[PDB]
Swiss-Prot record, chain A:
Assembly, per entry: Component of the 19S proteasome regulatory particle complex. The 26S proteasome consists of a 20S core particle (CP) and two 19S regulatory subunits (RP). The regulatory particle is made of a lid composed of 9 subunits including PSMD4, a base containing 6 ATPases and few additional components. Within the complex, PSMD4 interacts with subunit PSMD7 through their respective MPN domain. Interacts with TXNL1.
Gene field: PSMD14
Entry's family note: Belongs to the peptidase M67A family. PSMD14 subfamily.
Expression across tissues: Widely expressed. Highest levels in heart and skeletal muscle.
Organism this protein belongs to: Homo sapiens
Top-level taxon: Eukaryota
Residues carrying Phosphoserine: 28
Protein role: Component of the 26S proteasome, a multiprotein complex involved in the ATP-dependent degradation of ubiquitinated proteins. This complex plays a key role in the maintenance of protein homeostasis by removing misfolded or damaged proteins, which could impair cellular functions, and by removing proteins whose functions are no longer required. Therefore, the proteasome participates in numerous cellular processes, including cell cycle progression, apoptosis, or DNA damage repair.
Protein name: 26S proteasome non-ATPase regulatory subunit 14
UniProt lineage: Eukaryota, Metazoa, Chordata, Craniata, Vertebrata
UniProtKB/Swiss-Prot annotation, chain B:
Name of this protein: 26S proteasome non-ATPase regulatory subunit 7
Keyword Ubl conjugation set for record: yes
Record text on subunit structure and interactions: Component of the 19S proteasome regulatory particle complex. The 26S proteasome consists of a 20S core particle (CP) and two 19S regulatory subunits (RP). The regulatory particle is made of a lid composed of 9 subunits including PSMD7, a base containing 6 ATPases and few additional components. Within the complex, PSMD7 interacts with subunit PSMD4 through their respective MPN domain. Interacts with TRIM5.
PANTHER family, per the entry: 26S PROTEASOME NON-ATPASE REGULATORY SUBUNIT 7, EUKARYOTIC TRANSLATION INITIATION FACTOR 3 SUBUNIT F-RELATED
Residue numbers of N6-acetyllysine PTMs: 200, 210
Miscellaneous notes: Does not bind a metal ion.
Covalent cross-link Glycyl lysine isopeptide (Lys-Gly) (interchain with G-Cter in ubiquitin), where: 176
Family matches, as SMART domains: JAB_MPN (SM00232)
InterPro entries: EIF3F/CSN6-like_C, JAMM/MPN+_dom, MPN, MPN_RPN7_8
The organism of origin for this protein: Homo sapiens (Human)
UniProt GO molecular function: protein homodimerization activity
Function: Component of the 26S proteasome, a multiprotein complex involved in the ATP-dependent degradation of ubiquitinated proteins. This complex plays a key role in the maintenance of protein homeostasis by removing misfolded or damaged proteins, which could impair cellular functions, and by removing proteins whose functions are no longer required. Therefore, the proteasome participates in numerous cellular processes, including cell cycle progression, apoptosis, or DNA damage repair.
Keyword Protease: no
Family according to the record: Belongs to the peptidase M67A family.
From Swiss-Prot, chain C:
Top-level taxon in the UniProt lineage: Eukaryota
Tissues of expression: Highly expressed in embryonic stem cells (ESCs). Expression decreases as ESCs differentiate.
Reported induction: By FOXO4; expression in embryonic stem cells (ESCs) is mediated by FOXO4.
Record's subcellular location: Nucleus; Cytoplasm, Cytosol
Name recorded for this polypeptide: 26S proteasome non-ATPase regulatory subunit 11
Full protein stretch here: 368 to 422 of 422
Gene expressing this chain: PSMD11
Post-translational modifications: Phosphorylated by AMPK.
Family: Belongs to the proteasome subunit S9 family.
Organism: Homo sapiens (Human)
Amino acid sequence: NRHYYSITINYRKNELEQKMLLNLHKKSWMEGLTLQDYSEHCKHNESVVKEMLELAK
Amino acid sequence: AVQKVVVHPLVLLSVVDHFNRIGKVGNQKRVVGVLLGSWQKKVLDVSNSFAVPFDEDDKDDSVWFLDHDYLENMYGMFKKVNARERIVGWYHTGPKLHKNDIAINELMKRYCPNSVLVIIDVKPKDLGLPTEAYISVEEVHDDGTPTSKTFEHVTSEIGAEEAEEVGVEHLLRDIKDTTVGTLSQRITNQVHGLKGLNSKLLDIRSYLEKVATGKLPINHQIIYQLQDVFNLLPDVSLQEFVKAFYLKTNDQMVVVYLASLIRSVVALHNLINNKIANRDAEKKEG
Amino acid sequence: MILDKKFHGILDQGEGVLIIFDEPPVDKTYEAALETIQNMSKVVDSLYNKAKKLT
């Protein structure tokens, strides 16, 4: 610390970064049309998830 | 050639910078940026990009202004500091596909290799995925139209490799992770109907409008496949799927037994401690 | 040989109809039945702890 100090750091975000980056990250965790990979799990509940249910039991 | 591409949010936040450094001049036209990526591997991966001064004309649409010296200097310095990424294509922020894009993209078709095109929106109001990879390849048409530049839609995904997920997650502090369970699932199961309702409902209006009030043939051949795929499900009577409803309903019964039995096991510690703790705390309180 | 349960089949005398069928999901009713039987002892033991602490 002798002859060597630091300073605080803050951030800033406008509405364009909030909506564009927030919707961009939600879309980054979502699908393209948002209806594609739903039926994949809805129909995999009878094929693959059954093994996870038997192991869960 | 390319099945899927990977676009990092750094270039779209660079478009946020394109909308930040405007200076309130009142132009906000389709600023063209030089897209960078890795064309070596079969999959496309955009790391970063830069900008180039691009200005058009008000009346005449065929006016386009590019620069070769600035592109060779930014590509020379950027290649000197990082030789792992080279030029791939470009991208414009305009929501409408103008005719001049064949002349704008034709320069990077002659000098540069096959350039990918990405159309985004100037306002973050579109609920759908803002990035659409449009490859610049010439396709043969069956009706006999002359060979021209065709923009085929290539699927895209928004992902970060190592650090941008940490930076975005730290800057937001509001978004949630996958978090499999009740809320993250029911939110999708509630808002998904609007996620498809705004897109499909927003498309069928201009579609039905251009069906009767349309000219300048828009390749009506693909409409036969459109209504054909729409008619690939001719209202099945669900007669054969009854046994499948018995299987899924049987799994539902399994979930019922797991819920009732497991919760009945959880009720042990509560329905015991509620008695042994209250009676001992009461008999020993005074 | 059907009474020995070596394969799937059943005989017939009046009509002579041969029917072959199987039931793949065997590990479901066994684990479920074991959960019910094992949890019955849990609820009964709970009723023994409460019945002991009350009366």
